[PDB]
Design a protein around this ligand. Structure first.
Ligand SMILES: Nc1ncnc2c1ncn2[C@H]1O[C@H](COP(=O)(O)OP(=O)(O)OC[C@H]2O[C@H](O)[C@H](O)[C@@H]2O)[C@@H](O)[C@@H]1O
Length: 167
């Protein structure tokens, strides 16, 4: 039914592997989360790849927002529609002393946005938070409705399987 099969299911969370175009095309979701920074300056990782997908519309709209009242608290998400695609720009934390308390806030913003999210594991790339830590918060917060999670590299895939195995 859904084009791309999940590699793993845990409780109400389903895990997928691909780049942006693969997951946007292959996964059934109401909105995709972007692991953004407080500037909504999409320079790297998933943020760049989502911007490229939208052919710059995302960055253009981000600038607009960033912008109006005013710029963006760690997070705290900003929904934008780029044609069919709804992108929920959520400011995950940088690694640091409050990382857990802020991952909690970010995942809660995600879990409380209406619809089935497709989300990355926040902060686990350029922000340098341990994948398993961020994932642990994700699962703790997102404990009711169906939520879909994507990762990118085969390394991250093994990390998810292994962590979920420990549960
Ligand atoms: N081309 C891609 N397609 C799909 N997923 C990707 C891609 N590139 C990176 N990802 C990543 O998305 C997830 C989160 O990684 P990052 O994008 O590095 O996000 P984060 O660690 O939250 O750091 C955010 C920072 O990086 C961006 O430049 C963004 O503007 C912000 O400054 C990771 O699971 C996964 O490796």
């Amino acid at each position: 039914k859904e084009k791309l099969n999940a590699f793993l299911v845990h409780d109400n969370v389903a895990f997928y592997q691909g780049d942006v175009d693969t997951v946007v095309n292959g996964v059934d979701f109401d909105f995709i989360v972007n692991a953004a920074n407080e500037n909504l300056a999409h320079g790297g990782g998933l943020a760049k790849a989502l911007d490229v997908y939208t052919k710059g519309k995302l960055q253009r709209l981000s600038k607009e927002h960033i912008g109006l009242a005013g710029k963006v608290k760690v997070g705290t998400g900003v929904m934008v529609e780029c044609d069919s695609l709804r992108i929920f720009n959520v400011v995950g934390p940088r690694k640091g002393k409050h990382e857990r308390d802020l991952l909690i806030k970010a995942y809660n913003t995600i879990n409380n946005e209406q619809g089935t999210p497709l989300t990355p594991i926040l902060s686990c790339g350029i922000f340098g938070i341990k994948l398993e830590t961020s994932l642990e918060v994700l699962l703790d917060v997102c404990n009711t409705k169906e939520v879909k999670v994507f990762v990118y590299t085969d390394t991250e895939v093994c990390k998810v399987k292994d962590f979920v195995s420990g549960l």
